[PDB]
Design a protein around this ligand. Structure first.
Ligand code: WTF
Ligand SMILES: *[C@@H]1O[C@H](CO)[C@@H](O[C@@H]2O[C@H](CO)[C@@H](O)[C@H](O)[C@H]2NC(C)=O)[C@H](O)[C@H]1NC(C)=O
Ligand code: TON
Ligand code: NAG
Ligand code: NAG
Ligand code: CL
Ligand code: CL
Ligand code: CL
Lengths: 97, 231
């Protein structure tokens, strides 16, 4: 059969900001960054980019944890901009993807 | 996308799905199966892309399976208002919230069908007991339709691509017919996860945009399997 997807563990007992890091350490984070740059650049209109950045201070609070903290944890670990990590995680809702 | 929930002659529920999306050459590398642990024990399993915390495919052991397909309905300002002012939650986050909290199949169907969402979606849910298979066509506020299995009347499977099941499928993108033809040829007696993988390997059910195929059965949680396509 075709190759089975890698299988990893995520402990929900850990703080949200650290939950995914044990998994990220198995990856060349540049490849995650490269996949974001191709999917984002080829889809997002600028007014959404400004808008989400305009609203990051709100989206962080009214959207339910631990989803916001988990995203912020992986984003800092990868040295990415939270506005983009939130945009990828809301790709379906933005409708532009 | 394509999601299938079906029941064999023995009363067991099987659930499989293909996740179709462009940018495969980059996202295939990022596909992972994640076992989410509560106090050292597997609370639920999910499939995502590393960097994406929501689950479009998941399993609660011995409770239910969930997968979500795209439903293109409404305008952008409906998602914007639903998210900003009406405080609806993302589509893939409700799937994960359901896998973590819901105590059984019937409870998950209710959580998935009624919790307000920022966008539309098709939720396919599979359980453990007979008849426990349903397609939830979702609106932002609630369910537009609920389509359960009916094995006794011959409807032992449900197939959901990206279109309302009560209207005809676009001839331009008709993967539903191929899935049903393959299911009709497999048969309820030969139904299995392996057989469900073969069905989801049919063209064009398995197409150029398919990134991975997941097959699962909550009643047999150890057989959860995601296979990455033509890397
Ligand atoms: C309906 C499920 S779908 O994946 O096929 C889809 C169809 C249309 C619009 C949005 C989405 C969607 O849900 N996603 C888009 C791709 N995605 C990505 N996650 C990462 C994670 C890391 C990275 F470098 C790039 C990406 S792109 C998140 C989500 C599954
Ligand atoms: C992922 O987590 C599971 C559960 O915490 C691990 O499974 C346990 O493995 C140990 C030995 O490593 C056994 O003593 C336990 O009985 C197992 N528990 C269960 C519920 O299966 C699994 O090994 C972890 N995988 C990785 C790669 O760390
Ligand atoms: C509500 C927001 C805008 C803060 C965030 C989300 C992700 C939900 C969103 C919601 C809607 C949205 O609109 C996309 C407009 O595309 C039209 C031009 O092609 C963009 C983003
Ligand atoms: C992120 O940036 C910091 C600099 O503050 C650096 O120490 C670290 O190595 C960087 N990590 C990655 C993955 O780029
Ligand atoms: C599948 O078989 C059932 C019963 O024989 C029939 O009602 C249905 O129309 C068939 N569908 C296809 C696509 O052959
Ligand atoms: Cl949409
Ligand atoms: Cl959770
Ligand atoms: Cl059907």
């Amino acid at each position: 059969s075709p190759p089975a997807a890698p299988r990893f563990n995520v402990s929900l007992d850990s703080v949200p900001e650290l939950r995914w890091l044990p998994v990220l350490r198995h990856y060349d984070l540049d490849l995650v960054r490269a996949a974001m740059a191709q999917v984002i650049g080829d889809r997002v209109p600028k007014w959404v980019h400004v808008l989400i950045g305009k609203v990051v201070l709100e989206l962080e609070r009214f959207l339910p944890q631990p989803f916001t903290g988990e995203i912020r944890g992986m984003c800092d670990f990868m040295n990415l901009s939270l506005a983009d990590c939130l945009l990828v995680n809301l790709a379906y809702e933005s409708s532009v993807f | 996308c394509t999601s299938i929930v079906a029941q064999d002659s023995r009363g067991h529920i099987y659930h499989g799905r293909n996740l179709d999306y462009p940018f495969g050459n980059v996202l295939r590398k990022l596909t992972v199966d994640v076992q989410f642990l509560k106090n050292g024990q597997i609370a639920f399993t999910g499939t995502t892309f590393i960097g994406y915390v929501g689950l479009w495919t998941g399993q609660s052991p011995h409770k239910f399976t969930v997968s979500g397909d795209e439903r293109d309905k409404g305008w952008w300002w409906e998602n914007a208002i639903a998210a900003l002012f009406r405080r609806h939650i993302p589509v893939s986050w409700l799937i994960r919230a359901t896998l973590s909290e819901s105590e059984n199949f019937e409870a998950a169907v209710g959580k998935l069908a009624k919790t307000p969402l920022i966008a539309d979606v098709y939720y396919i849910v599979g359980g453990t007991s007979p008849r426990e298979g349903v397609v939830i066509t979702r609106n932002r506020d609630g369910p537009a339709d609920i389509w359960p299995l009916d094995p006794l009347n011959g409807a032992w499977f449900r197939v959901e691509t990206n279109y309302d099941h009560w209207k005809p499928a676009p001839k331009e993108d008709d993967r539903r017919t191929s899935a049903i033809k393959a299911l009709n040829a497999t048969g309820q007696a030969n139904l299995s996860l392996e057989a469900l993988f073969q069905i989801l390997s049919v063209v064009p059910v398995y197409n150029n945009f398919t990134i991975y195929t997941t097959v699962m059965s909550a009643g047999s949680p150890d057989k959860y399997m995601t296979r990455i396509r033509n890397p």
